[PDB]
């Protein structure tokens, strides 16, 4: 789970 698509 991340905050941005590219993280």
């Amino acid at each position, epitope marked *: *789970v*991340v*905050s*941005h*698509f*590219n*993280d």
Partner: antibody
Framework: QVQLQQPGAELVKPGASVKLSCKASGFTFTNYWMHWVKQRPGQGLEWIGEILPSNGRTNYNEKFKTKATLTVDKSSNTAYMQLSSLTSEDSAVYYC???????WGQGTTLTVSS | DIQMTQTPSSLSASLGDRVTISCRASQDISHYLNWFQQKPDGTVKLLIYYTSTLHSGVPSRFSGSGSGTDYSLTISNLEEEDIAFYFCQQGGALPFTFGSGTKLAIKR
């Protein structure tokens, strides 16, 4: 623990340039995007761009492309954002942040006045 | 760029009240919707990311929901430390963009 250390404020003159620092601590910033965001009271919040310290890859908001240049210093675990040709339009609070598991700096209040 | 429409811009509530703040994107952002909270001293924290994941240390009274274009942040029972400025950010596409903010105040 995870912290991003930014200077409180700076006053610079129109036409000069400024290099804002963002020192990370509590983590090694190699594999985290380091973002920059501009906050000026009327206008909302604007994302300037991010840099990935490991390979220096950058993604900018087109609007800020030769206003803002992002770099990094791996030995000091520090992220920098140079703002050139400063105008009154550039006075604002500038934040740095990491992502994922985001943390933000306290923000640097930059005033550009002659 | 994806425009984020945040409502309401301002809201007053009393301690213990349920509070709901919403963000709508102009494009699908694939659940990458983040909620930030900002205090008067300028401190900013990420509260919730990927629509509904609470960040480290955030209290269980916070929660988020949504999908597609339509997202919301809810505080089930308001506390005083929640009185703040809230803003969403979509992280589904570059350049990342922010909602306009919600100033949450105390009703008297």
């Amino acid at each position: 623990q995870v912290q991003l250390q930014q200077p409180g404020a700076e006053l610079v003159k129109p036409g000069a340039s400024v290099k804002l620092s963002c020192k990370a601590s509590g983590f090694t910033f190699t594999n985290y995007w380091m973002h920059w965001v501009k906050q000026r009271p009327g206008q909302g919040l604007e994302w300037i761009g991010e840099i990935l310290p490991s390979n220096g890859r950058t993604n900018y908001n087109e609007k800020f492309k030769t206003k803002a240049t992002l770099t990094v210093d791996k030995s000091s675990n520090t992220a920098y954002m140079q703002l050139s040709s400063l105008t009154s339009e550039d006075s604002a609070v500038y934040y740095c942040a990491r992502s994922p598991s985001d943390y933000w700096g306290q923000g640097t209040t930059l005033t550009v006045s002659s | 760029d994806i425009q984020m429409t945040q409502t309401p811009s301002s809201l007053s509530a009393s301690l213990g009240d349920r509070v709901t703040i919403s963000c709508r994107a102009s494009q699908d952002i694939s659940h990458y919707l983040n909620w930030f909270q900002q205090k008067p001293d300028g401190t900013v924290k990420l509260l919730i990311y990927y629509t509904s994941t609470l960040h480290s240390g955030v209290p269980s009274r916070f929660s988020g929901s949504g999908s597609g274009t339509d997202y919301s942040l809810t505080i089930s029972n308001l506390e005083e430390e929640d009185i703040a400025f809230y803003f969403c950010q979509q992280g589904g596409a570059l350049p990342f963009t922010f909602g306009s903010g919600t100033k949450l105040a105390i009703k008297r």
